[PDB]
Every structure is written in C-alpha cells, then in structure tokens.
Amino acid sequence: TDPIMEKLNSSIAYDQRLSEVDIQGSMAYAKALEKAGILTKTELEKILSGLEKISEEWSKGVFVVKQSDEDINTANERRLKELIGDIAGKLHTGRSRNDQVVTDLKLFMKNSLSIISTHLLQLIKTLVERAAIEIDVILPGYTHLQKAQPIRWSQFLLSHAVALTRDSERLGEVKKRINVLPLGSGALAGNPLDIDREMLRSELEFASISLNSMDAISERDFVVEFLSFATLLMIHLSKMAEDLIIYSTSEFGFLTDSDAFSTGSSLMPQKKNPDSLELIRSKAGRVFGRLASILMVLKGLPSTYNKDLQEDKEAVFDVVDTLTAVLQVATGVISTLQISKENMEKALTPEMLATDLALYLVRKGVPFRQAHTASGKAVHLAETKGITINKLSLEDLKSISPQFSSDVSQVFNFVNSVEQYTALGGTAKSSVTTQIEQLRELMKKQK
Amino acid sequence: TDPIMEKLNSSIAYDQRLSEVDIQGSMAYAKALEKAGILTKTELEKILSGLEKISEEWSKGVFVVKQSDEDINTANERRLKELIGDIAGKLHTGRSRNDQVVTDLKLFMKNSLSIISTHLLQLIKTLVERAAIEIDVILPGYTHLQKAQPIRWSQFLLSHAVALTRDSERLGEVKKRINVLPLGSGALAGNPLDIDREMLRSELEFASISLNSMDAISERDFVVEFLSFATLLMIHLSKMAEDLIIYSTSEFGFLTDSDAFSTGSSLMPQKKNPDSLELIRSKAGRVFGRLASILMVLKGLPSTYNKDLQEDKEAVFDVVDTLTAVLQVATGVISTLQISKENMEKALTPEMLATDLALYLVRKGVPFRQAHTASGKAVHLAETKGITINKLSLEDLKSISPQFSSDVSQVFNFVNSVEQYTALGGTAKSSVTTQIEQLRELMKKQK
Amino acid sequence: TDPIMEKLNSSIAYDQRLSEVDIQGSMAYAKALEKAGILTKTELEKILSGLEKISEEWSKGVFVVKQSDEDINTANERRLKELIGDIAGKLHTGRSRNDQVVTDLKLFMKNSLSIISTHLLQLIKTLVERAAIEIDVILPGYTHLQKAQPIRWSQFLLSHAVALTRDSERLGEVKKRINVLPLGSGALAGNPLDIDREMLRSELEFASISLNSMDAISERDFVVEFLSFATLLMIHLSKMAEDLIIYSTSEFGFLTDSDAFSTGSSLMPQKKNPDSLELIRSKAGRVFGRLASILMVLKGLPSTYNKDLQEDKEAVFDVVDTLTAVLQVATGVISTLQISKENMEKALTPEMLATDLALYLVRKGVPFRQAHTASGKAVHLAETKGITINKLSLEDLKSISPQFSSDVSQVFNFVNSVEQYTALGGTAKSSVTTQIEQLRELMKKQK
Amino acid sequence: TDPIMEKLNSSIAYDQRLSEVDIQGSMAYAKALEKAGILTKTELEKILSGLEKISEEWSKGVFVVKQSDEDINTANERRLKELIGDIAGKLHTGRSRNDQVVTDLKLFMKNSLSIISTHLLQLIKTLVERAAIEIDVILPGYTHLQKAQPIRWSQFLLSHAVALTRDSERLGEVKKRINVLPLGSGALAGNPLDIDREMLRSELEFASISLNSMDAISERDFVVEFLSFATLLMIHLSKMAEDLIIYSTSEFGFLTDSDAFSTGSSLMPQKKNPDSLELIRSKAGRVFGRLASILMVLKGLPSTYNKDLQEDKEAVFDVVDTLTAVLQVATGVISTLQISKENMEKALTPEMLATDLALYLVRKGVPFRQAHTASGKAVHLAETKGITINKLSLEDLKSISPQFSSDVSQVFNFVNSVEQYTALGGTAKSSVTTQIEQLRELMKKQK
C-alpha cells in the first residue's frame, strides 16, 4: 500500500511490449479451459472475441492504460472484463501470474531471437562476401600490434566471421531451451484443473513442455544463457571495433568509414570520427552489466517463487534492443567500408621476409636452428651494406650459405609469402577460398 | 629483461600440470613433421623416445624444473635437448607457442570436462533415486519463504535435478566446441610446412580442425563458455545450498546433515553447522569471478595474439578444481542427509487447504470469483468462531454456498490436495513418477 | 544503417532531466564570456533572460522537443536561438560538448547525493531509535543459521546501523570528488579564451577546479566511485533483507511486516509475503550490474575523449532512482514492523547456556581447557538423565567439579548471560547504550 | 566425500603469510588476559617467550607444518602447546577464530597498503618528473583516436598522474577504515572476560576499535573497498598501457620501450613487443574478477558469521601481489622509455590549425558562427587549390573575409596554438608548470 512500494512494482512502464504474447497466451489458455469443461463453447467464443479486440486496440495504439494497471497482464485483464463483462473472470481459473510471467518472456524471446538470428547471419554473409571479392588484397598481420607477417585482407575478415558463426551456433542452442512451454505450471505445484498442456504447447507452438512445475516457474536459465551468448557476441564485436578503429587512424590509413557511419568536421573534413565503432565497443559493457545483474539476483535465492525474479524483463529487453541495433550498424560498417590497397601494400616491409628466407632453407634440408641463423646473418649483412634483405645479391647470400640458389629471389615477394600457408586454415588463396565455402555451407544450415 | 616482468611472465608455477598434454602435442607434431619430409624415420624414432622419457620423469615425480624454465613448454623442450641433443631443435620447425598453448588448454579441458560430467551425472542420479524412494513424503511448498501449499518432497528434489540436467546439456555443448584442433595454425598465418593437420587431429583425437589460423590462435570462446556454464551450475547449487540450510535450522527441522558434512559442538550436541552447504554456496562467487575477469581480459583486444591471453590458465585450473570438489561434496550431502517426515507433515496447516475449497466449488460449476469469495467467507467465518476451516460444519458451508455437499470433506486432506496436480509436471504421485522416468532416460543418454 | 546509428546516438529520451543543470552551466559560462569581453553587457542580459525562460518551460513541462534534438544540450541551444536570435551562437564560443557533459553529470550527481544522504541518515536514525526503545528484547544470536548464544535485539539492529554508517562515510568522500569543476576544459586542450574558471566555480558552487583538461574530459572516476559506493550499500541492505525475511517466516515468528510493506491472501490471512524486502534484495544485482558495465566500458580506452563514455548517464540515473526508493522502503519496513518478544524469548534454550557454565568455572580459577570439559560432562549427564542443563542439581554439578556452588544458578538466566558482554562493542546493556551515543555523535558529523 | 570437504577447509596452503600477524595478535591477547586476571605474570612471560620462538621458526623457514593443521591460526596454536605445554591453552579463553580471522587480515592489509602506497607514489613522481623535463615536446591530442589538436607531451603525462593521485587519495580513506581493531568481538556477542580492548588497540597499533561485535565479525567492507580501489587503479593503468601500446606502433612511432620491458626478434630487430604494457593491461580483469567474486559472496548472507566469508584471503592476497608487481613494472616503463620528438612534431598537421583560424576572427570581434564559417571556407579554398591552409595567401584570406590581416601568419605555429590554453588546466606551458606545483603539494599530503 506504500506509494513508493507500488511504484517499485509497476512494470507497466516497460512490459507493454508483452501485450500480444499475453493475449496469445490467454487465448490458448481459454481454449484449454473449454477442454476442461470450465468454459462453455459459447463463453470461449465470447472470450476469444474480447481478446481479439484487445489486440486491435494495442495495434491501433488506442489502448488506454488506467492508473490501476500495475503490469501488462493486468491491463489486458481489465480491458477484457470491461468488454465481455464478468465472464472474463473465469479465464483466471487455475493459472497464476508465476505461470504467465515466464510464458510471456519465453514467447517474447522466441520472436526476438529470430530477428537477431537473421541480422547475425547477415553480418556473417557480409563478411564472407566481402572476403571473396577482396581476396587479392594483402596487408600486415599483427601480434602485439607490431607487424609480424603478410596475410590477405580476407583471412582477417574471415577470422571475425568464423567467431560470429559460433555465436549463431550458441544462439541455436539457447533457442532450443527457450522453446519449452512453462504454461500450465500453476503457482507452484502444477495446474489444479488437470489441464491439457499438450494442447497449450501446440497452440503456442512450443517444441515441448516443462518437466517440473517448481523449476518452470522459478528458473531463469534461459535468461542467463541468452545474456551470456549476447556477451560473448559483444566481445567479438568489441574486438572487431578495436581493429577497425585502429586501422582507420591517419597513422594506419588502411581504410575509411562511410559518412553514414562516422562524424567529421567542416573545420577539418579529413578527421573522420568512428562513432559507429565506438558505440558498438561500448555496448559490450552494457550487455555484460545485464549478465552480471541477473546472475547476482539468482545467487542464493531459495525455492520457489520470489519477487527478485522481476528483474529479468528489463535485462532481456535492453539486450534484445541493443543487439538488434548493434548488428545492423556492424553490417552497415563492413559493407560500406572503403579499403585502401595502396596503404596496406605500403605497410608491407622486406624485413618481414627474413623468416621466409629461413623457411626457404628449411625446405632445402637445412635444419631449423641453422636456417634461422643464416637469416639473421643476412639481416645483419644487409644492414652493414646499407640496404634491405631483398636487395642482397646472390653472391652475398652464397657467402652466408651455399644452399642459397638463384631461386631464392622468389622469396622476396609478398604474394609468394602469403601462398606458403596452404594447410587447412592458413592464408594461401586455396585455404581462404576453402574457408569461404565452409562458412557458406554453415550459413545454409543456419549456424 | 626486468626481474619483475620476468616473474610476471613465468607460468611454470601452475602450468606444470599441462606436461602430459604438451608431450602429446609434441609427439603427434613430430610424426607430422616426419611425414612432411622435415624429419627422417631415425630422427622421429629418437625424438619420440626422448619424449617418452620426459613423460616417465613427470610420472615418477623426478623431473627437475630449472630456475630458467619460464613455462611447461619450455621445461620439456630443454629436457628433450638434454636427452637427445640437437635434433630436438627440429621439433619446433614451423610450430609456435601461440598454437601450442591453445592446444594444451583445449586438450586438458577435454579431459577435465569428462571427469566433471561424471560427477554431474552422479549428482543427478542421486537426486532422482532418493526422489523415488521418498515419493510418499509431503512437506510445505514455499513462495516468498511462506508456506503456500502441500508439496511432495520428491517434487522438490526433482526441481533441482531438472535444473542440473540443463547444465549437463550445456556441458555437452561446450565440449563439442572444445573438441576442435587448433594446432597447425602457426603464429597466426598458419603452418608454413603444408603439414597434415588432419593427421594431427587423428593423433590427438580431436573431432575437427580449426577453420581460420588467426581465430584459432586468438579466440578464447571455449574458456568463456566453460566459465559461463560453470557459473550457471554454481547458481543452481547455491540455491540448493540455500534451501537445505534453511531446512536444517532448528526452526524448520526438515532435515539433518550427516556428521561427515557438518560441524557441531561438544557443549551443544544438537547444533549442527552446515559447512558443506556454505562452502558450496561461497564457490558461486569464486567461479563467477573467473568468468568476469576473462570477459574483461578479452574485451577490446585487437587481432591477433596478445600477452593478455595468458590469464586463461589460472582461471580454468581454478574452476575445474572447484567444480570437481563441490560436485562430489554436493553428492555426499544429498545421499547421507536425513529427513524428518514428522516435522515435514507437522508443518502442514489447514489454512493451506483454503484454495482447494475454491477448486471444489469450481468443479461444481461455480465461477472462479464466486468460488473464491465463498472460501474467503468460509475462512473468515471459521475465524470469527475460533476454529480451523476443516472444522466448519456442513450447514455453515451451505450457509455460504448451497453447492457445498458432504463430499467437501475429502477436500480437507493433504494427500488429496497433492493429487489434484496430475497434469504434466505436477506434484501428483503419477506426475512425479513420470518425471523420474523421463530423467532416467535423459541420464541414460549420457554416452 | 544511418537512421539506426542516429537513434543509437540520441540521448534526449533520458537526459532531459539534465535540463536545469545545462541551463545553469550556460548561465555561468555566459557570465565568464562577458568578463572575457566576448559578450557585451547587453548581450549577456539577453542570453541570461532567455536561459531563464527556457528553464521556466521545462519547469512548467511545456518544453517542445523537436525531432532534431539529439540530446538535452542541443535542445536548449535550439530554443535559446529561437528566443533571442543569432546572438545565442556566441554562447558556444570556446565550449565543447566534452566539458559540458561532465559538468552536467557532476551537477546532477552532486544534487542527487544530497537527497540520498538524507534518506540514508533517516534509515540509520530509525534503526538507532528502535534499538533504544527496544533495548530489553533478547533473542538468539546466529552463526551458520544455527542458534549460538542469546543477544539483545538492539545489538542486532545496531550491527546494521554501524555498517550503514560507513556507507554514509564513503558517501561524503565520493561527494567530495564530484564537487570539482570540469567546465572550462574545452574539447581536451583546455579553454582557448583564457576564461575565468574561478568565476565559473563560484557560480556553480563547486569546491575546487579540475587540475588537467584531458583528465577532466575523459575521467569517469566519479561515476565508478558512486556506483561502487551504491553497490556496497546494497550489499548491506540485502543482508538486512535476508535477516528480516528469515525472521518473518512462520517457522521463526520473530516479527511481522506492516500491511503497507507486504502482500497477504484473503484465503490465507496469516500469509504475509515480504515483497518489500525481496525488492530491496534484488536491487543489489541491479546496482552491481551498473558498476560492472561502466568498469568494462572504461577498460582499455585510449586518451582522450571517446563515444564509449556516453553509457554513463543511464547508469547513474538508474542507480540514483533505485537508491532513493529502496532507502525509503527500508526505513518504512523498520519503523513499522512488529516484533514478537514472546517468540523471540521462546527461541532461547538452556543448551545455549553451556558456554556460560564453562565461563563460570573459568572465573572460579579453573583452567579454560578443564572448565570446557566439565561443561561437556554436565551436558552429557543431563542428556542421559533426560533433563536440561539448568535442571542439574548441585549434587550432580559437584561430582563433576567442586568449584560449582549455589551461585551457579545465576548462570542459567539469559539476561545474566548477555550482561557478561560489557567490554566495548558487546551485547551488555552498557555497551548497547554506548553504541547508541557513538552512532548519534557520528550522524551529527555527517551533516 | 568427507576428505573432499576437509581439503576444502585447508587454508594452510595459502594463509601461511599470516604467521607473523597471528603471532602479533596472540601476544596482544596474552597480555590483555593477564591484565584481566586470566593469566599470572609467570604464565604470561612463558607464553610470550614461546610465541617468540614460533616467530623465529617462521623467520628461519624451519617451521614444520604438520598435515593436521587446517590453517595458520591452528598450526601456531599447536606449536605453542608443543613448547610451553598446557599453559598455551589459556590463550583460547574468550577468544574466537571469527575474531582472529578479521584481525589477521586487517593487520596484513595495513602493512601491505604501506608498500602499495610507496610504489604508487613512485609512479606518480616519475610521471611528474618526466613532464617537467620534457615540457617542450609537442604532439597531437586525440579524440576518437583521430588527430584533434596539438598538446604538450607533458599534458598527456600529467593527465595520467592526476588520475593516479585520486587513487592515492582513495587508498588513504580505505586505509582509515582498515585501521580499526576487530579483536575482542568474540564469536559474535563480544568478549565475556571484560577484556581491555584499548590495551589491544595500543599494542596492535590500531587507530580505533570496532563499535559492534556482530558487525566486526561479519563485515568484509574493508576487503570490497580495497578491491574497488584496486580495480579503478587498474582501469587507469590499462588505459595508460593502451596509449603506450598504440604510440609505440611502427605506424605512430612516438616512443620506444626499453629492452628490459619489451621482447624483440632476431630476424626483425626493429620489432619490439610491448609485453610489459600487455601484462599490465591484462591484470585489470584479474583484479576486477576478485572484486566481483567477493561482492557475489557477500550478497544475501544472513547475520552473522558464515563459512562463505572464508573466500576473502585468496582474493586479497592475489590483488596485493598483482598490484605490487604491476606498479613497479609501470614505473620502470615510464622511466626508461625513449621518446621521439621528431616523429611527434611530424604528426602535427596544418589542418589542425583551422579551429585556431576561427579563434583568430573571434578575437577580432567576429562572432563565433561567422568565424567558424569563414574558417571553413578557407579550409575549402585551400583544398580546391591543392594546398594547405598555412599556404593560403593574405589576398585569399581577405577574399574569404576582410578581417584577416597580416598577423594571421602567427596562427600557423603549433607552439602559438598550444600557448592559447593559459586558463587553468590547459596546455600552455604556464598551465603545465602550475599542475606540476599542485601535484607536488598533493604528494606531500599523501605518501
């Protein structure tokens, strides 16, 4: 009765989006009640009509929430009575809000997961398709942000795509456990009217039904799981954001964002701020915060139902909206991205080829340890001569090792360098292309 | 290098346990090298023998770790050099610490996850089994920690078993993705020797091979998923600890812990401290802490490899060491716990039957709200007459609603109340029985 | 796409409450600009008046938010221009959204903290008052949720009050660092007009001025601190809620919540669900989540300004709104709960006095180890005799130890038990009153 | 699985570093007992001498830890009996582990905090010192990691030092709440022997004593506060690492790390990996994870003592070790890094002066909007002419606006640019000198 207490319980402010799933759940329940004999065929007909009118009021946006509406379920419950009179009270028989709440969220989630899945797969398709087209671009690979060796721009794009593919895989698993109907669990012990849950299932299109009533109304695993999946996904995008922010600095000059996804200044148009990327990177923390909150909420709570559980809606609503938006922005960034081949090519230094020189020898039967030393020597010689490793003459190389035949010239070529990695997941064109194929088959399975 | 930075880079302190898996990676790799013409049969033979001898030393606990051994991979390399000499230097041809580390971890985790599931299933079995034996026991069902309605003890044990089975499903799922061979990805661009990754897979027993070299070297999703799974599991166990702790208070008296999993007082013979349950409950934060740190370690890191990743080992070893012990202790507690059917039944109050009184009129065709008002008048009446509702005379009842007949007597029985919930997932004995079977099959499919 | 990023970049939906502080910043800035000779006295007067008008609009609730308004700062600029013409543009001279946004949050937070401080002090005051009035109530002291020894209810209430007092102390520390003027830092290099920051500090009533432009613009320590403070505060409240919920069970029966702070049933008049306490408890996770998200948002961010920083607003707004409500509900729960001195005293058992029996011997000159065994023998003997410790006759006591005398009867008195704890901080009445005074001395300093 | 639980309680594996502080608390308690009449002068001197012996055994590393020792407190108790005989048992009179534990950590932390403080102050001193020396170096300031405007290198160093001084400020506050004596609280109701807590306070060197026994036993605020301080400190360091990791890229080339704090390549001499900076950045998550764990462990725990509290030791030990190391490495890096003034100046672009161009007109009396637009035109004219704005002829400027005079030439100077920021906190030399003086005074107050 305390005014502040009423306020703290008012979910009506944010749960209004659960309106349709509420109605969708009420209709199914009304149909099962008819089967239980609780409702006469005519009462059901009248109820389903009332319910269907409520949906229209919601769709049109002409539904009026009264001061007495603490939550969505109530709002729609009130409207039903206001419409079909007192027969609406029968609809309540046997069920509980504890039962409705989880059915509402799962139902909302199934719908939400589908939209998110579509956008995720589209992000992947965008990454693989751009990889295919730009398969000839070669740039430096980084370890500790220091240039290590050449790689194809496509191997870089594919590494992100491959990680995102595991996200779709996890999403599929999460969606499986969310597709379990909890309705018909009552307030704690089950539905007292021996209702037909199978009917409810088929009506709401769930894949199966909850095994235990106590568990069904008190567990929020499906929320934690969705939250974890969302968090790892965001970690993946934060890593992609970091890369593209760094690659788009004047210093690197590897690429440029579209004006639609960046901010500039009339005073110095050259300065293109990566707003899009910074927004995506920040959402990682926001989503993480939601995962951390629900985990702390659930810790140490006894069985069975407790009010603490009401924290779930705001968490899933916020993460669902964040992902739906974030994903679309990411797809936009990647697709309208402007790559600079010249700058990427210019970053490639002959010094990065010292290892390839050692590989050349290793292949000519020279044991690793020995081949590594020969390269170092060549690096030092080139240094003392005032030139670069690729500038060393056959004679200079011979001085170091007689194994250095004239064909060593081919080593000093960045494309030939990249083409050494032909093993399954390397940078050679063959491997890259194989990856594009594998990923395309994955998307077909919808993983 | 700075003395402190060197100490911070050293992992030899805790990674020693990865010795066997290092050797296993080295053996398989040595074989692939020979196949790639990098090693001769005689060189392969000598090396494999050396590797076997190092294993021997670890097993006998006679391996000596010198002060300069930065980590386990290093320790074994030095020892191989000390054993077979210079040809040992050929083993690292084309191999990088970057793809060695992930291979070691995934390998160790594969083995750990098998042991952990063994314990998880033993826990689930235990719960399902006891539930079967004590299916006739009834106790209060709680909502907001207040007695709500009669519930079967078994329906309570099963709510936990059902939650724990979902964990099993998730454990199976993380293992699927941990079972992917990352070896042969080189430092980041792949292996430059056209090495047979497929052969490495077969040797090491992984189910598949990584699609992208950069991803395989930098991703730590497998660590995240495992910690995420572990955290949810702990959330389930801390809830279970909360219940059993409250149920073991002198105020509840529902059960007692065996002396093996508690602590008492000589001065106070009946005071039994539930240490086991509190230790289990406290581990939830410990495990969650590891998840949080790794997500933070990963957030914002750029491609490809970074030293930051080193934080994965300690987080993983800790969680595996925690779950193994906690699951075992949880099993012991559940199995040796003694319940008091007396205190459980004695806790069942007539007030709890008020709802059934309403269910009764509903069955007599009485509209829900009408049936609800009547039970309210009934309880209030009994109140104004200083008596329990079950002691209201038939005439009193009829004075409230004509539909109250002699059969309303059956209503005032806890077993009869419990039986109302025959619907799928309810507390009726038939429903509990079905659940026990369904779970037995679930467990049966553990291979 | 662009429109998606556009909405994702908009904050007007929530930051409208920063309206007044924005107006306040602008007014101070205008005054300093005039002093710097950027504005004419006439121009100043026009701008100030215009700012007052806009302030009125928001106050009356008639401010029209044009769709072009991406945030509050832009909204007010639009309006000012619409009210006084082109001269309003001069107000932007040398200013940036970078130093505007931090001044806005600090000003809002500095205000909000005053309100939270008030509510916090009221909670403590309430706990201390009830502790004084109910200083004679005695109940069991718990350890591992098992009865340990009798304590005074006031000792229980004061343990929560002292903890809350440290939160109150941390609050002042936090408030101290929020009171630092960041305005006049520009985009990052400072303010280029040699503006008078001292004048700005005076106008806005800040305690000091920010030391470094880059830090003032990019630091969010004041947010992390506030959130860290808020989380610990909630941990304490969650512990308090945990106690009251357990104590209000029908099993414990120590107390009952007010009607305004609980939910009952018409069919079950004695079922009082502690809704208020469960809400308070759940707000811990919700507040913690905000801490964790901001900590992650800042982790690894390069200098200086980054769009990631905008996630701060919603974080503090939520936490500020949560604390304000929860503190008010906690105070009401305490002020209006009814305790059961009857039930509390019933819970005290003779067995709890076994330890005092040993103390009695210790004070007689008996070595600790020996006095302990004697009490155990006294306990066992009682057991075998089917009676309680207090029932043992002097004959039985003397056979155990000659040090037992007639005065041993005094031991078996709960009040006499408690009164042993006169050493500072203990449960003796003299200690409880000393605490009451000390906590009141403290609160006088917190104002 | 009893042995499993037993191992779970064996803190002896890590708590050994608490030997001295345990010895210290004991000696203070022994003296207090003697004063209270529990010990005779002779028993007292025997116990004190015995305690000294144990101290030495620990100092000499000769103390034999028998496998029956659960923790350090027990091990020491055992040893005293093995030295002084049954007189040792007198020390237990009225003391509790609950009481010892908190006192042990508080003493350990107090000492550890002094060490952390000095290292923190050293880092701050090094940053402030390098800023004084290198006050003439200028480089670009970044917003969105895009060149914004020229700032002095010293402004960048000071921005980090200032954030670090706040951390120092927080450490002192934490320190104050840790410096409160919890000993004398007993198991939960206080000490029954009327022990002199003031004596204990004096002996143990605490500033004050706990106000309430139940709080002193159950609270862990001092642990969470330390962890929060640690996390923010690490957040500041992770950011500093990020800056220096990027600034040391080949692409930026602003600075080079010492050989002692990096790792290079034999084949690539000019490649130096920022290992130190990556290890530092990675600890932020490690420390954060400990904070999150403890918070999760404390959430919802009932009064008073629970085994869950046992998770604090490892958390504190890990963070104290980590911080101590990280702080020394950070100081090393800053003190020995090589700066490239040439590459820094080379980063300065004429375009960055466009905004100063507008500022120039504002000082002439041209309103902000007009000035910003005129500058924009000059930027566009230059662009269309294929030249930089600093090469725009006076005639050209006069065609954009007659307000441009010959003195506009002074705008095109990066030192003149930096020098406009004379307002407090700005980048002008005078403003940077003032920060140094302000920092110096602060360092005097907190050491």
Side-chain angles (χ1 to χ4, degrees), chain C residues 335-341 343-366:
Chain C
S335 67
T336 70
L337 79 80
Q338 286 292 274
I339 64 170
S340 177
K341 310 180 181 193
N343 281 61
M344 292 181 170
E345 65 187 16
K346 297 310 169 302
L348 280 322
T349 65
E351 187 190 62
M352 295 170 83
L353 305 173
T355 308
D356 288 3
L357 198 59
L359 290 177
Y360 164 89
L361 246 41
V362 173
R363 300 184 177 102
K364 270 296 183 72
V366 180

Side-chain angles (χ1 to χ4, degrees), chain C residues 142 166 173 228 236 243 303, chain D residues 177 215 221 228 243 303-304:
Chain C
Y142 292 90
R166 296 191 292 255
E173 297 169 355
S228 187
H236 296 155
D243 293 320
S303 305
Chain D
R177 277 181 288 278
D215 177 68
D221 286 16
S228 286
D243 280 347
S303 304
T304 57

